[PDB]
Amino acid sequence: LSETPAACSSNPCGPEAAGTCKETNSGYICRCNQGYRISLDGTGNVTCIVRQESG
Amino acid sequence: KTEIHGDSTKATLEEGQQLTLTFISTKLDVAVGSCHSLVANFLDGFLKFQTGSNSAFDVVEVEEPAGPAVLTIGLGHKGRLAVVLDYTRLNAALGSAAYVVEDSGCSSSEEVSFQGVGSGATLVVTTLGESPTAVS
């Protein structure tokens, strides 16, 4: 149904920071690079920004 | 900050809130009081998580953690949960990883049990993040 964007296709865990992206059966998986941590969003999704704690 | 310093702890998750855990583990297993369970197989270098009672856990590969890990849990609907894991890497670096479940099939505000925290474990409750994006 037309609500959500194609996870890995729309580039979620693919900012100028993040390291890895993986679509799942229940959404997607994100992985960061050395200097980044995952910042989860205000709906229940995730993407990478500079490592401090929860993003 | 909620400094646990034990082997396990439990937080109250809420739709619109997040739960951050700074723990030091090598194989932490947690379950959420509605539907969520995972095993941070740090040692083997993979993160396994399921959504439901009896379900298969997906793996997100881990870049060889050293112990220090931040596990964050946020719900933004009912089933749509996000789990942030931030692990210190043995490879002279840090590595952070996450996964999201667009419909875990849960309802707002569930009790999250963090177990296997090892030592140095400390919890912090936050509010949910910002900017939606996932596939369902």
Swiss-Prot record, chain A:
Places the protein is found: Cytoplasmic vesicle, Secretory vesicle, Microneme membrane; Secreted
PTM statement from Swiss-Prot or TrEMBL: Subject to proteolytic processing involving both the N-terminus and the C-terminus. The first EGF-like domain (EGF-like domain 1) is removed by proteolytic cleavage by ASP3 and is not present in the mature protein. Released as soluble 35 kDa protein after proteolytic processing at the C-terminus.
Annotated site residues (Cleavage) in this chain: S2, E3
Disulfide bonds: C8-C21, C13-C30, C32-C48
EGF-like domain location: 4-42
Domain notes: The EGF-like domains 2 and 3 and part of the acidic domain interact with the galectin-like domain of MIC1. The presence of at least one of the EGF-like domains, EGF-like domain 2 or EGF-like domain 3, is required for targeting of MIC1 and MIC4 into the microneme.
Role according to the record: Escorter protein required for import of MIC1 and MIC4 adhesins into the microneme.
Quaternary structure annotation from Swiss-Prot or TrEMBL: Interacts directly with MIC1. Part of the MIC6-MIC1-MIC4 complex.
Name of the featured protein: Micronemal protein 6
Protein source organism: Toxoplasma gondii
Source lineage: Eukaryota, Sar, Alveolata, Apicomplexa, Conoidasida
Range within the parent protein: 93 to 147 of 349
UniProtKB/Swiss-Prot annotation, chain B:
GO molecular function, one term: Toll-like receptor 4 binding
Keywords: Cell adhesion, Cytoplasmic vesicle, Disulfide bond, Host endosome, Immunity, Lectin, Signal, Virulence
Main location, first listed in the record: cytoplasm
Disruption phenotype: Significantly reduced invasion efficiency. Reduced production of IL12 in host cells during infection. Slightly reduced virulence of parasites in mice. No significant effects on parasite gliding motility. No significant effects on parasite attachment to the host cell prior invasion.
Compartments it resides in: Cytoplasmic vesicle, Secretory vesicle, Microneme; Host early endosome
Superkingdom of source: Eukaryota
GO (cellular component) term, any one: host cell endosome
Region (Galectin-like): 1-136
GO term, biological process aspect, one: effector-mediated perturbation of host innate immune response by symbiont
Keyword Signal on entry: yes
Disulphide bond pairs: C35-C106
Keyword hit for Disulfide bond: yes
Free-text note on domains in this protein's UniProt record: The galectin-like domain has been demonstrated not to bind lactose, glucose, maltose, mannose, heparin, fucose, L-arabinose, N-acetyl-D-galactosamine, or N-acetyl-D-glucosamine. It interacts directly with the second and the third EGF-like domain of MIC6, and with part of the acidic domain. The MAR (micronemal adhesive repeat) domain was at first proposed to be TSR1-like (thrombospondin type 1-like repeat) by PubMed:9027753, but PubMed:17491595 found that this domain represents a previously unknown protein fold. This domain is jointly responsible for interacting with MIC4 and for host-cell adhesion.
Subunit: Monomer. May form homotrimers. Part of the MIC6-MIC1-MIC4 complex. Interacts (via the beta-finger region) directly with MIC4 (via the second apple domain). Interacts directly with MIC6. Interacts with murine TLR2; the interaction promotes activation of bone marrow-derived dendritic cells and macrophages in the host. Interacts with murine TLR4, the interaction promotes activation of bone marrow-derived dendritic cells and macrophages in the host.
Stated role: Soluble adhesin with carbohydrate-binding activity. Binds to sialic acid-terminating oligosaccharides. Required for attachment of the parasite to the host cell and subsequent invasion. Ensures correct folding of MIC6 and transport of the MIC6-MIC1-MIC4 complex into the micronemes. Facilitates the correct targeting of MIC4 to the micronemes. Triggers the activation of murine bone marrow-derived dendritic cells and macrophages and production of pro-inflammatory cytokines, such as IL12 (IL12B/IL12A), in host TLR2/TLR4-dependent manner.
Listed name of the protein: Micronemal protein 1
Taxonomic source organism: Toxoplasma gondii
